[PDB]
């Protein structure tokens, strides 16, 4: 639908700017769907725990915990 | 006994939610659990925790601080 | 959804049931769950019949019967 | 010819019902079957008890005994 | 032997109406059998039974399950 | 003692009729066996069941569902 | 506590009435807790199933049809 | 759901006819699902493509390229 | 027959009480049996001697030299 | 850089289209890059390729010979 | 030593109220040692990080995170 | 449990006891639980059977030579 | 590049200082970059939690945490 | 220490008695141990008990049964 595909989308941009190295623009883009209440955050936070890197576990823990 | 069953059902349904794969629905639940101080709420933790799911892991990490 | 949860709910209740050691309790559930019509039942019973016991086995055959 | 083709329709759509996990839906085609004596019915059990699945296989039992 | 005869002629009939994929003539054949109290009706069932098919097994216990 | 000796003798009957391929006299003596309540049915049962053959099989629980 | 020691007993009780080569006295024993609606009737079952004799299986599934 | 059966019930339906080895009522069937718009069209295509069958891919590539 | 009867349920209610790892009912038990002079005594202190647990066999030579 | 992310962006969504298995938005999303102009167009082309799905080889391939 | 006795103690009845899942207990008699400042607290705070249970790490850490 | 609870206990304090190589306080341990009548004596006493110690059987054999 | 060569001359300079083995000077330069805002702090990670130091992860994440 | 020299002093002496094929002094020894209450005692009695020679398991039982 359309809530899958912006779900598919956000994972999309978050590993694209973590495949950059921009980390960054990564915390932006999180910090922007979260402020937003943004259920596709999860998506995004999913998409950088299976990345393997630990850049990425942290920018993900620091998000997830400024819930 | 009615204790062991809501237990099971609490943990049951942590991993039903896993499973669908809504992460604001175990967060939900959790937040319940917690603020009901339901002694099932533990339960429901080892069902995320023994997941395998680094996202679960989180979840369980973050609604544990708040204890 | 919530008729999928339900199902979830139902099939994990019955495997509960059964690992209890009470095997009239789980009669009991799918004979309440049969004589409401829900679909749930189905799912109770599948849980039963891969569960590998041979009591559970019976049990599917015997309420299924009754259709 | 038109036999074979609605025989093998309704396998298909018997397998098709079974996939989805809607066993009630599987015992309404074949009850739907039978009332008509529509030899496809037969099919439609072989699908059934071919496919590995003990629901399946019980669904089918049961449909024999109103035979 | 007449009677070793009809047996073997009647097992082949069953055998034969079971490879078309025919199981409705098959029932056919085992009820006419059964209704004229022939013995060779056993002489068929094992037939079926050996056969190694789901759908022959059932129909074997199905109208084995009328005498 | 007649007992075990009333046991044998009926459990070789019923294996020497299964053995000519006889099974409609198996039904016979199983029938009057059970209707003369002689616990040696039982006996003549278990060779039935431990000897492997389908028909075997049928003929002993089409006979045991009677009591 | 009673609960399981009366479970234990009749299972043993089982048991040991099968080991006997006694399957009339199993069927009895079975009718009696069946009738007095004994809780104790599955733990008996079980001690039936599980023993792997077929005579077992036969006793199991035709007490248990009659729930 | 309508769509998912109609979806199934079209790549069944051409499965069946080039089974038959009629591959005329295959390009009618796609012919006619084409000039419907129904999307179900693609679902009988893939059931064509990973047929294995070279014929199917010429079927498959010449119906394709009418869009 | 009661003598083996009450040996095997003397051996089997040892067992049990030696599963619940309560083993101050196991020696009130082997006692009652022991001041009654009940051969079914030996069926116990046999039952708890080849149970391979340490404190059956201290229970059982304790019990035993009291005669 | 924006250019890469519209890139990266069309390719997900292609892929996406895909995997919920309805090639007939694939086409869509591939004629509407395609009437603008948008160089993601190829970005989105390579995606179906390496995706080994043959439908999605048919839809690049006819969508390439519009250029 | 009573030093060695009560650190001992306190890690056994940690590791006991583990054992019968009640981490919410642990919690308690963690909590209890931590407001008396009884160096025993660490000989519990061990005997849960070496049990290789993951709720046994979360609650340490959470514990010794309030020191 | 308070029951089990302080069967733990003493099974624990047997245990350390006779780690620091001080059998006569095991002894100690051992001979006020007697006195006392209290039924942790014997989860005291399976702690030590087990152990693997000489020393420790001699005890707990001396321990039931009182009873 | 300008922005790459302060990402590689920062991380290069953390790198030196760890194997310096001055941590305290890593924290001071992890802490004079984060208080500029410069990118080049998230180069400066990279170069430590890829370390396989301990003491690097420590001081990473301890820095991560001040964003 | 001098409750650990004297406790090693009487393991030493006890199997140096041992060693010379003396057990009429090493009871000698034991005897005057037990007779003064000396905890030392024990050491020598887990001396005897490891170093084999089914002599030195017997002499220690029959001190020990003194206690």
């Given at each position: 639908m359309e809530e899958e595909r912006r779900r598919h989308l956000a994972a999309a941009e978050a590993r694209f700017l973590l495949e950059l190295g921009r980390p960054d623009?990564?915390?932006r883009l999180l910090e922007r769907l979260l402020e937003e209440g943004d259920p596709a955050l999860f998506a995004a936070l999913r998409e950088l725990l299976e990345s393997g890197d630990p850049l990425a576990r942290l920018i993900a823990e620091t998000?997830?915990?400024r819930l």
């Open positions: 623009e990564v915390l998000v997830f915990r």
